[PDB]
Design a protein around this ligand. Structure first.
Ligand SMILES: [Ca+2]
Ligand SMILES: [Ca+2]
Ligand SMILES: [Ca+2]
Length: 340
């Protein structure tokens, strides 16, 4: 086992209805040589993250919502996405009044590749891999075009006025949403990204509805991830249906955060729930599978990788109330499939 003091609490890696990532670490595969992008709120300066992060980019076009004094820039630091007094609209709906900083991108990045076996904090699923933080979400979420520009650039796509990404990602984690079906432009950007050779892994969404009514799960060429509990059942918030392909642990997920309710104050660790936490389990397992395929000189297309991940899932706890794909992502079975 890795020596990280809080790894023992990360049931979602090793325990019942977890992803069996420990079995693959034991086999010697950790995501070595794989780049995963996290298209999210940005990144924290965090002792348990830094060593595994590569240069990213900040695609937030709104200077106000980015909280860093400018528009697009080369520092994807998460300044905090808190708001208060309906600063992001919606008055007088009490549900939209206020929120504390989520540190979402860092929590997600930690699930993929927290610095592991370093005697502090937590472990990550693909702790041999590296993450590129692609900041697209600020105070009031993100603009669609900022999200898809970032996604595309993260796979090695050229964006005008942005230096070319020197660390193209083979797995693109999008733990984000947006209401409604897939726009023609979004699909175009998604297809371009996939066809570069990158697997796009997305959170199914947290509105307890059919995923076909939300972006990006309504899009083609994305791997859509639902959220399960320690009980191996659907998390009550998880979007569902035919547009969900598989599931991963999505509640009581311990990862890297900051204690700050507004701006950053001190690096810490904390549990969260969301399909946003389930997606990085899948992205992490995808990186494990690529590292294994690399070891035998096997090329995997995103379609082939996606099929392995869906094909080899472990069983749900009996029966679900709504469809959540083929099963829970299983790193051990997935790697067994590629190594033959
Ligand atoms: Ca900026
Ligand atoms: Ca910035
Ligand atoms: Ca650690």
């Amino acid at each position: 086992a890795p020596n990280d003091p809080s790894y023992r609490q990360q049931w979602h890696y090793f325990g019942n209805y977890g992803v069996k990532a420990n079995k693959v670490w034991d086999r010697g595969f950790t995501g070595q040589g794989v780049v995963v992008s996290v298209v999210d709120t940005g990144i924290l300066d965090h002792v348990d993250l830094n060593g595994n992060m590569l240069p990213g980019y900040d695609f937030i076009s709104s200077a106000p919502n980015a909280r860093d004094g400018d528009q697009r820039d080369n520092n994807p630091a998460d300044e905090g996405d808190w708001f208060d007094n309906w600063d992001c609209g919606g008055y007088p709906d009490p549900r939209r009044e206020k929120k504390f900083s989520t540190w979402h991108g860092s929590h997600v990045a930690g699930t993929i590749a927290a610095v592991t076996n370093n005697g502090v904090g937590v472990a990550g699923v693909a702790y041999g891999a590296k993450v590129i933080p692609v900041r697209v979400l600020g105070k009031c979420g993100g603009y669609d075009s900022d999200i898809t520009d970032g996604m595309y650039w993260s796979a090695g796509g050229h964006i005008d006025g942005v230096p070319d990404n020197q660390n193209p990602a083979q797995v693109v984690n999008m733990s984000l949403g947006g209401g409604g079906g897939c726009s023609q432009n979004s699909q175009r950007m998604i297809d371009k990204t996939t066809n570069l050779g990158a697997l796009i892994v997305i959170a199914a969404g947290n509105e307890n509805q059919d995923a076909s009514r939300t972006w990006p799960s309504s899009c083609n060429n994305v791997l859509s991830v639902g959220a399960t509990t320690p009980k191996g059942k659907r998390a009550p918030f998880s979007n569902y249906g035919a547009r969900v392909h598989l599931a991963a642990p999505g509640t009581n997920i311990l990862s890297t955060i900051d204690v700050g309710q507004a701006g950053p104050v001190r690096s810490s660790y904390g549990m969260k729930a969301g399909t946003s936490m389930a997606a990085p389990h899948v992205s992490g397992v995808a990186a494990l599978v690529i590292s294994a395929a690399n070891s035998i000189g096997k090329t995997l297309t995103p379609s082939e990788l996606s099929d392995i991940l869906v094909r080899t899932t472990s069983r749900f706890n009996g029966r679900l109330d709504r469809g959540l794909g083929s099963g829970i992502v299983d790193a051990n079975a997935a790697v067994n499939a590629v190594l033959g």
